[PDB]
Design a protein around this ligand. Structure first.
Ligand code: CA
Ligand code: CA
Ligand code: CA
Ligand code: CA
Lengths: 234, 234, 234, 234
């Protein structure tokens, strides 16, 4: 039982409230730069992740209760060539000792090890014909790179996107939405996810992002703000 | 400056935390029944509204700051004949002394009086060819029954719908989403709304709903739960 | 089950988030003036109370759970003659339809009617030899003007006092503290209070204050800010 | 700018939400055992500390704003010989890289290095004639083992104590209270503390405790629960 909440209007660099993995870094301007950028140009074969320093209890084995939570963040994905973007950015939950996995289409969160359980909401900028539908999309993933559900997403180059994710334990309902405030465009996806049967009691959480493996398929994956709130009923 | 938040898993009847208007009532089972139902069958020409007992400050004239808020609720709309549904349910903000207005397509919140300023998110179950696009839809309305924006909505008879509405003051961005947890279907709409130039400093808020005027065009408009949270920066 | 929280840095006049009773009023400067003041001088035989517009559920008969809550406020009591002060200011919980009671030493909250159940934390500025110990004191009262416990209080004329009250349901522990930030002085009291056996499921809450009945025994009873938070486990 | 809050009804062992230092450990029963205990008997010359995994921003150099926060916890101090208890338990704020300092009377938080800035609320069970008044007491400390203020404390062997600490940035007022719910006894202390001029922008926080250096002067220093909430205005 317990709760956790926080809010960061921007990110302060060199402060241990984030666990940076891979190429991830926080700029002097307060931006969480998940993937490498050289002179403004995003680099290929990059992978970066950022986890909140503390994990939270998503369910309790003694009471059997499951936590409900919400998280919101803003992010920007900018690409020199909007026709060739890859690979995506995702918010995810995983074991406390979670470490970066495969590059590219695996978004750094997938690579079946029953110890690498993971639930994620992905903003996929590149269609992987081997497991992706068609075109850019929002996706909800449980233990694999193949989403349990996807919805089309009209990505807008360099535009600030507001994301909201909520999980209602009582209905095991995970909802994810993306809105471009300046453009008044919006997208949403929902799926049933039984976190109690997927994840361990305690989990770390945050962001992961990768750029494409092939030349040209690059984009930035910058998070600008982040708030979170969870509550596990006693 | 200030804040307000609350959560009601269900509604207790005969308790002054709600201001009931029109035909609205709270059942012994804890359901907020906005429109009349006779022996399970919704009645026509019904109008009911429910406001939280206390208003909240949405903006401050001294500091010029604007509040950000979020609200979530679950509701059900059941109709004997799914081909003929009317008129809709809405969440709205208005002056503290707000009173029910016109029936039917006006959803009880519209009837131009600069004192009847109102912002609402509507779940419209009937297309009014005079100001509505086509088919059922989600809508964001500012001072008039004609929405500044609408998106198609696939209503599901008697199914529990989860709604989430958020307002980010910094971007004047109002977002509304509806999800059917059991069906994993979801809809969303977003629009720029400048509450500071539309509403007074203090506003009351809640639900309003109406049934059709013509025979047969009926439906229930029942709210099952409601949570709210606002924060006006100092 | 449910929750409620709010925060008011100051009080806006003519806004229905407060239910004013007796002589209570909100000044143009945002001060909650509980008792009458004429040209700066507090009047005798005055009684004023202020309740939050909405009640909250302090316990649930279905689950049997009890709510925990906290409230904080700042107040000032100024008197022309510091040797003759009366009668006091109190924070209290009572039935939703609660109305002002007796003047003077009864602090407007006492007058045994099993329907007038009340729990209060009092800041008593006048010793009533018939039921009060000796000198000014903090007190916790349950259903009567005679406190279940009192602690000495060194009141400071016109000084801003910060009050914090907390109720831990699990231990039925009610704690009340008063601090004068500028003076670094502090006082505290604690007592076991079984709200489930004292109050009804839903209660309204707020402030009550009275001035003395006899000439000279006067003081202002002004509240400057107020925050509240309750949570009733499901 | 930002915020952080959490609540732990008890402590789960082997979970990275706490940074354990010195002898500190979490029992299988969920108790945060700060100092060593051998077969129920507390050991001498022990020192243990526990910090929340993430730091929080207590003030911002860009806006100049200061955060307000509150924290509550329950703890027990049990000693074989109640006549000889040492040394104490404290809640403290310090630089993010804070490491345990001196044993015994220094409570593991003191040892003047302008980089070892620290603010703490101490529950001192042993009077150090060299810098302590007389008898057990509550104390507020800023950069040194000599408290800026102390108040007498009647410690009760093995009794659960509820602690509440609040910091109001606007008045630079730090308040600390201790109550024994079962005994209805209470103690409180308050002092002006200018955190902006004492601590760095970001700080880690938590508990520290030590047992006496001399034989016999021992006690347990067990924390049972902990909640925290901070808000740094933008
Ligand atoms: Ca892909
Ligand atoms: Ca319509
Ligand atoms: Ca009295
Ligand atoms: Ca000492």
């Amino acid at each position: 039982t317990g709760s956790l909440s926080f809010s960061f209007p921007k990110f302060a660099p060199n402060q241990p409230y984030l666990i940076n993995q891979g190429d991830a870094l926080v700029t002097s301007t307060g931006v969480l730069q998940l993937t490498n950028v050289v002179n403004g140009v995003p680099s290929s074969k990059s992978l970066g992740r950022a986890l909140y320093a503390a994990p939270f209890q998503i369910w309790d084995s003694t009471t059997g209760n499951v936590a409900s939570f919400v998280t919101s963040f803003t992010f920007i994905i900018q690409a020199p060539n909007p026709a060739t973007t890859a690979d995506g950015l995702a918010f995810f939950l995983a074991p406390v000792d979670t470490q970066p996995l495969d590059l590219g289409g695996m978004l750094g969160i997938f690579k079946f090890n029953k110890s690498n359980q993971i639930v994620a909401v992905e903003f996929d900028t590149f269609s992987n014909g081997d497991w992706d539908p068609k075109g850019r999309h929002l996706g909800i993933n449980v233990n694999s790179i193949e989403s349990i559900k996807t919805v089309p997403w009209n990505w807008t180059n360099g535009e600030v996107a507001n994301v909201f994710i909520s999980y209602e334990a009582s209905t095991k309902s995970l909802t994810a939405s993306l809105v471009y405030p300046s453009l008044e465009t919006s997208f949403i996806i929902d799926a049933i996810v039984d976190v109690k049967i997927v994840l361990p009691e305690w989990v770390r959480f945050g962001f992961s992002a990768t750029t494409g493996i092939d030349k040209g398929y690059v984009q930035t994956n910058d998070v600008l703000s982040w708030s979170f709130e969870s509550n596990l009923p006693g």
